[PDB]
Structure 1
């Protein structure tokens, strides 16, 4: 599994190149893995991935929550890996064929797929939560090794960890702004994803250092 420095992944959702680059550079000594999503990509282009690689020594997880039909999913994965992303996050709710399409491209291109099971926001309780355990089981059956689970629901995150096993890699968002606790989340997740608590702080470096300090024993 990828060796995430300090078990902390930065969710870089700022929407302008200058600010995104500044903040990421300021926390560079604490984080070597950055999650780049559509807020930044749709604002600055896929070349932002290239710029991050050039400026920082950070792995890039493209958080695109791929959720289309198999044929389109394959195209999205190809374009994303072509740009330099180390991994891509895919939704499991659209079914097994859609996930398999992503896995096939990842295998062919030598990259990784992260399967998003349950989400962290309130709305996830409406439809996703009830399908989450089966989506996770589906991931295991398909050979998925990397997963995403919610920090906001410890009981659900714990169950997801059980389903995927200790060998699987699990990252978890919802820490900080959404209410999740760093340490508690790391009881089940290999790494925590943190966005606003760091990138909106007056001193992102201090925010990152503080978060790491609170989980130093972990």
Structure 2
């Protein structure tokens, strides 16, 4: 399959249609508030029928709340969840957790992302912005193949297809550019994850 996680930022039925269409062709699907707002958490389980589901609600709550939230999501079928690294040291951990340490837009992460990255362990991997392949490459240098790296910020007006993967990422997260025409997934055909076969 292609090293692409498709963000399903669209309506429930259309999201299911895309997941059905792309099952086995891509590495997974990203489910966010657009979908969860429509009918609730059940949508996670529907998409999870068709592939690995990363739930991305940018989780950033205190531990006893974050714990409950992650548990509900994984129980509904999520493979993993994206959480904010800024919570450190109150950071959800474990193999179901991806830790965001720099965003695609300017934030307080910018002054500290590499120190934060170096301090975090016992997680599935990290989210690094694919619109900054230099950041992805430096991250991979720091951590080697010890953890996954997944990267959004790929598509029009960010990193071109494969830019983050070439810089060291495992998977690129892409939304509208693929949703508007899923045939475009062929642009990732030449690429393979840097370190891990699955997200």
Shorter-normalised TM range: 0.7 to 0.9
Give how far 1:132 is off: 0.8
1:87-117 CA distances to partner (integer Å, 9 max, x unpaired)?
A: 11110012122x1xx22xx4xxxx5111111
Partner residue, 1:116: 100
- Write the distance in 2 (CA, Å) between the matches of 1:212 and 1:74: 35
Q: Is the 8 A contact 1:88 1:112 kept in 2?
A: yes
* Structure 2 counterpart of 1:148, from 100, 103, 127: 127
The answer to whether residue 44 in structure 2 is matched with residue 46 in structure 1 is no
Partner residue, 1:193: 173
Partner residue, 2:65: 72
- Write the distance in 2 (CA, Å) between the matches of 1:42 and 1:161: 35
TM-score where L is the length of structure 2? 0.88
The alignment partner of 2:56 has SS state of strand
The answer to whether residue 17 in structure 2 is matched with residue 22 in structure 1 is yes
- Write the distance in 1 (CA, Å) between the matches of 2:24 and 2:78: 21
- Write the distance in 2 (CA, Å) between the matches of 1:191 and 1:36: 16
Moved over 3 A (4+): 213-216
* Structure 2 counterpart of 1:129, from 101, 110, 123: 110
Partner residue, 1:215: 191
Partner residue, 1:167: 146
Q: Is the 8 A contact 2:130 2:153 kept in 1?
A: yes
Give how far 1:165 is off: 2.0
RMSD: 2.0
- Write the distance in 1 (CA, Å) between the matches of 2:161 and 2:44: 27
Where does structure 1 lack aligned partners over 5 or more consecutive residues?
Answer: none
Question: Is the helix fraction higher in 1 or 2?
Answer: 1
The answer to whether residue 9 in structure 2 is matched with residue 13 in structure 1 is yes
TM-score where L is the length of structure 1? 0.81
The alignment partner of 1:113 has SS state of strand
Partner residue, 2:77: 84
The alignment partner of 1:93 has SS state of helix
Residues 131 and 7 (structure 1 numbering): CA distance in 2 closer, same or farther, change over 3 Å?
A: same
The alignment partner of 1:182 has SS state of coil
Q: Is the 8 A contact 2:124 2:147 kept in 1?
A: yes
- Write the distance in 2 (CA, Å) between the matches of 1:53 and 1:149: 24
Give how far 1:214 is off: 5.2
Partner residue, 2:163: 184
Question: Is the strand fraction higher in 1 or 2?
Answer: 2
Q: Which has the larger radius of gyration?
A: 1
- Write the distance in 2 (CA, Å) between the matches of 1:178 and 1:9: 18
